Design a protein around this ligand. Sequence first.
Ligand SMILES: *[C@@H]1O[C@H](CO)[C@@H](O[C@@H]2O[C@H](CO)[C@@H](O[C@@H]3O[C@H](CO[C@H]4O[C@H](CO)[C@@H](O)[C@H](O[C@H]5O[C@H](CO)[C@@H](O)[C@H](O)[C@@H]5O[C@H]5O[C@H](CO)[C@@H](O)[C@H](O)[C@@H]5O)[C@@H]4O)[C@@H](O)[C@H](O[C@H]4O[C@H](CO)[C@@H](O)[C@H](O)[C@@H]4O[C@H]4O[C@H](CO)[C@@H](O)[C@H](O)[C@@H]4O)[C@@H]3O)[C@H](O)[C@H]2NC(C)=O)[C@H](O)[C@H]1NC(C)=O
Ligand SMILES: Cc1nnn(Cc2cc(C(F)(F)F)ccc2CCC(=O)N2CCN(c3ccc(S(N)(=O)=O)cc3F)CC2)n1
Ligand SMILES: [Ca+2]
Ligand SMILES: [Ca+2]
Ligand SMILES: [Cl-]
Ligand code: NA
Ligand code: NA
Ligand SMILES: [Zn+2]
Length: 805
Amino acid sequence: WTATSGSCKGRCFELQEVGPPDCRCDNLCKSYSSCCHDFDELCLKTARGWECTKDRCGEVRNEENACHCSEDCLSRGDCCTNYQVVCKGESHWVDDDCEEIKVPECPAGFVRPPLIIFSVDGFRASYMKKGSKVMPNIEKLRSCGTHAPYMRPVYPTKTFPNLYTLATGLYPESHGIVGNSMYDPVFDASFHLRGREKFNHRWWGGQPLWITATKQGVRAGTFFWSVSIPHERRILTILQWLSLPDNERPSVYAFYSEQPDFSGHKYGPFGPEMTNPLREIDKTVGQLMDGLKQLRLHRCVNVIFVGDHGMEDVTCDRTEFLSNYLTNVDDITLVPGTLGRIRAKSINNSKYDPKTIIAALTCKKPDQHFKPYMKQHLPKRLHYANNRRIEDIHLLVDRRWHVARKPLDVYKKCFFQGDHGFDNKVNSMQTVFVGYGPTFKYRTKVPPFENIELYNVMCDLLGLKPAPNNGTHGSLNHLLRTNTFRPTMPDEVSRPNYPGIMYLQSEFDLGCTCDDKVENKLEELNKRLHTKGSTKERHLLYGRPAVLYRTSYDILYHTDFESGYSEIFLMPLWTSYTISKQAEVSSIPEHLTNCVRPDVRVSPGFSQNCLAYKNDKQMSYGFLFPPYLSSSPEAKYDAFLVTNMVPMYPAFKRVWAYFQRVLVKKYASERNGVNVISGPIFDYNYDGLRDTEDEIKQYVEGSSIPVPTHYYSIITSCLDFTQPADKCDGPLSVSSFILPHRPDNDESCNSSEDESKWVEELMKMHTARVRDIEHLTGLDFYRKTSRSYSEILTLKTYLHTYESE
Ligand SMILES: *[C@@H]1O[C@H](CO)[C@@H](O[C@@H]2O[C@H](CO)[C@@H](O[C@@H]3O[C@H](CO[C@H]4O[C@H](CO)[C@@H](O)[C@H](O[C@H]5O[C@H](CO)[C@@H](O)[C@H](O)[C@@H]5O[C@H]5O[C@H](CO)[C@@H](O)[C@H](O)[C@@H]5O)[C@@H]4O)[C@@H](O)[C@H](O[C@H]4O[C@H](CO)[C@@H](O)[C@H](O)[C@@H]4O[C@H]4O[C@H](CO)[C@@H](O)[C@H](O)[C@@H]4O)[C@@H]3O)[C@H](O)[C@H]2NC(C)=O)[C@H](O)[C@H]1NC(C)=O
Ligand SMILES: Cc1nnn(Cc2cc(C(F)(F)F)ccc2CCC(=O)N2CCN(c3ccc(S(N)(=O)=O)cc3F)CC2)n1
Ligand SMILES: [Ca+2]
Ligand SMILES: [Ca+2]
Ligand SMILES: [Cl-]
Ligand code: NA
Ligand code: NA
Ligand SMILES: [Zn+2]
């Protein structure tokens, strides 16, 4: 019930919410059908439109008008945004030259520069260049302030997950808005864009910026706008709140535009019909900036211009139908479109089987335009699994396509020419970031970054402590003139042991063999120095990784590589080696094919054994430092130490051996040397965080040797490739991956072909940030470089995407 006979007189766009049944006058009352009877008349005035004209200048105030051009409008804070231009000979903000804002220039009574977030739906990154001729105000923000060539959204690249990620700094698996449509099996309730379930607070986790602000004493405008409120009235409302008295005035505001997304779905991302929505959005930015200029706030407020996701060409004919693959199509529920999520239609059917659905959807048609995954197998960079609202079975849809359950779903629903939701590394899905104001830098371009980082920066802009989130605070310090956050590196929790030679060969009973009994004081002191760390500066270039949890591990040195060997997991946590551009690849010699050698620094009890692999018919082994890249025949024996061995499915060994034999030397050639850190990851509860021992679900049969869910590598070189990786004076360059450790290559449809045709494609799909690996291992890399810590945090958030420009 709403008692809609209250009044909005003196309450239009009130900031505090009034509870049912009393009627509301806030910017969300329409969406709840709860506005007072006189909300339209009082709060949504339209008379005489949105612009002053010469003949209105100096008019007698008429309270009916949408906005005013009477002499008293400046002190009332309700002039039309163009009032000073039409009536007082002033210029539009866009016509003024840009001039560096070195210090905030704020009216007295302003405690801090306000922040205005101007959010645009479906604004594809490339619109900034391609539409620049019809967007002069946006182009002035971009060229005079701080801009990125693009900003990466979160997956799925849909509105609700992304706007709420912008507001919280959280991945959708953590904040709970994992799609525009969701079923929660614990609530037994469905969330949809249409209707009332979405307003229930139980769906929305984390802490959005307006709550962070309010908890810390910083007042916030209400961020949400009902769709029927015209944009001109939204801008006027913001400008009116900015005229409130000091103690009542908010410091943070949001504007939202449904465009250009609305027209992009109808016309495609570059339909000729898209020029006018871009012009209209630019005009709205111009009203805001003119309005700030009237209030003397145009060199006081920080403005962020930001989008939720881009837009791709998608039409009805590019739809795959599950009815062309599955026999049982009526036994499933599909969430369809630019991603798929599948679950059982009925929980009472125990002849539903995910294994059979996946197999029926795998590589079944030559050009197939989607790929099925159990969610724990999705690329870890998507961070899309740890939530009960994410169905176990997921379809990753190719850009430009849809999936649907049956043809009748698509013609009983062609209209549309645009859509979005695909993998967040797809170029068409990228969106925009510009920051302009006293706290942002002047005429500065910054590299692309992820939208999960912005909440921390918005908190820095407002002097707030951010709630715990998934940004890396400090990684965006290079966007800011001041208010930077100066983090300190985490403290190491476990210090390593440095074992020497402590065991005789006969103490080991591992079932391993090696033909190594090939028997010099010159060369002998030398090999002793290598085991004590004499080449360590060449192979460990950025210091040893720090171990941020409690565990027992050993540093082991070798001529060609250094490792941190876990006595608990029986294998290295990390293995670090440098490969110069001059390095040569060699074979594994015949007599060494099955060689595994006890390591006399590490007890039998803290070693793997060969018998376990012999007996486990599913599981084989590989090595972390590759024997192919040994510096000499004699050094190569170190690569067969049992402390360099790790468990690998034979199907995974295909991928790993090709990476190590072919790709590393390719990278060294191209990048002028590389330093590689490789290791295992265990994430059996798919939470993106390092597993403890009692979470491990699989061991090499009959043993305590844990099986990794993934293998990573971090591949670092000099950004100035004219300097070799091991003698780099300035910034670094990194690419990394987290490969899933699977017992088949069903993910790669062309895996019967030579590895040259499919392995690197797989690795690109599983590209990762160094920070993703940090979460999954509890290790902290790049501890000892020449570089500032914020620069290193930016390097750790980099993702190498393998998209063109
Ligand atoms: C990205 O950043 C985020 C934020 O930093 C990281 O997420 C944090 O990760 C921590 C570990 O996974 C986690 O800390 C746990 O908190 C538990 C208390 O939880 C409530 O309180 C917080 C704070 O206000 C709150 O935000 C939580 O919100 C979640 O849950 C509600 C729904 O109930 C949602 O609305 C909301 O969206 C959010 O859901 C997400 O997180 C949960 C897990 O908390 C998932 O289940 C969801 O799928 C979704 O992703 C809560 O309201 C606390 O209980 C935990 O302690 C347990 O484990 C420790 C080990 O130290 C042990 O001492 C205890 O025994 C205890 O276990 C007991 O319970 C078990 C379960 O019943 C049981 O098995 C045992 O036998 C025991 O009885 C733990 O400290 C923190 O909640 C989240 N925060 C958020 C906001 O998500 C995230 O990791 C980052 N991601 C990456 C990749 O880095
Ligand atoms: C979601 C979400 N999370 N946080 N916020 C708040 C937020 C955060 C941020 C920012 F600062 F974070 F950037 C910036 C702006 C906003 C306000 C967004 C807003 O006013 N709307 C209401 C209209 N919405 C909407 C879209 C489409 C349809 S449909 N399918 O029926 O056409 C129905 C809808 F209700 C989009 C959200 N929105
Ligand atoms: Ca959107
Ligand atoms: Ca885990
Ligand atoms: Cl969805
Ligand atoms: Na085996
Ligand atoms: Na295959
Ligand atoms: Zn859309």
